[PDB]
C-alpha cells in the first residue's frame, strides 16, 4: 500500500488519489527562507539548484536542506514529504538537514501557492514546510 506510481498518495478513507506530480520535477518550487534566503526544492525529484540527488537546497547559500524523495504520504489530512540527508548538521553531529513538506489541504490557495515554510528546526535540522494547497484537499472542502 501507500502511493501508486509514486509521488501520489491516496486517501485510504476515500480512495481518492492526490498527485503532486505536476509539482514534481527538477524545476521544483521555492519557499521563502526568512527575508534573506529562498529555498529551492523540487517535489519528489531532485532540484536543479541542487546537485543530482538533492531535492531541496537554498538559493543563496546552497546548503542542501534535503534530498529528492518521492514518498508522498497521507498523514493527518496532510500529505508530507521529507527530504532528508541535507547538508551536515551545524548544530549537531551526524545529522543533516531535512525537509518536512506538509501539504495541507486548504481550499484556499496561496497568492502564488508556495510551499510555506512554517519555521526552522535548528535543533534537529528540520525545515518545516507546509503547503496549503487545494491540491491536497478534498477533505477540508467539507469542513
Curated annotation (Swiss-Prot):
Name of the protein in question: Cation-independent mannose-6-phosphate receptor
Compartmental location: Golgi apparatus membrane; Endosome membrane
Subunit-structure text: Binds HA-I and HA-II plasma membrane adapters. Interacts with DPP4; the interaction is direct. Binds GGA1, GGA2 and GGA3. Interacts with the heterotrimeric retromer cargo-selective complex (CSC), formed by VPS26 (VPS26A or VPS26B), VPS29 and VPS35; which is involved in retrograde trafficking of the receptor from endosomes to the Golgi apparatus.
Organism field: Homo sapiens (Human)
Domain MRH: residue ranges: 5-139
Disulphide-bridged cysteine pairs: 7-44, 50-57, 89-125, 105-137
Domain comment in the entry: Contains 15 repeating units of approximately 147 AA harboring four disulfide bonds each. The most highly conserved region within the repeat consists of a stretch of 13 AA that contains cysteines at both ends.
Family: Belongs to the MRL1/IGF2R family.
Maturation and modification: Palmitoylated. Undergoes cysteine S-palmitoylation which promotes interaction with the retromer cargo-selective complex which mediates its retrograde trafficking to the Golgi apparatus.
Function: Mediates the transport of phosphorylated lysosomal enzymes from the Golgi complex and the cell surface to lysosomes. Lysosomal enzymes bearing phosphomannosyl residues bind specifically to mannose-6-phosphate receptors in the Golgi apparatus and the resulting receptor-ligand complex is transported to an acidic prelysosomal compartment where the low pH mediates the dissociation of the complex. The receptor is then recycled back to the Golgi for another round of trafficking through its binding to the retromer. This receptor also binds IGF2.
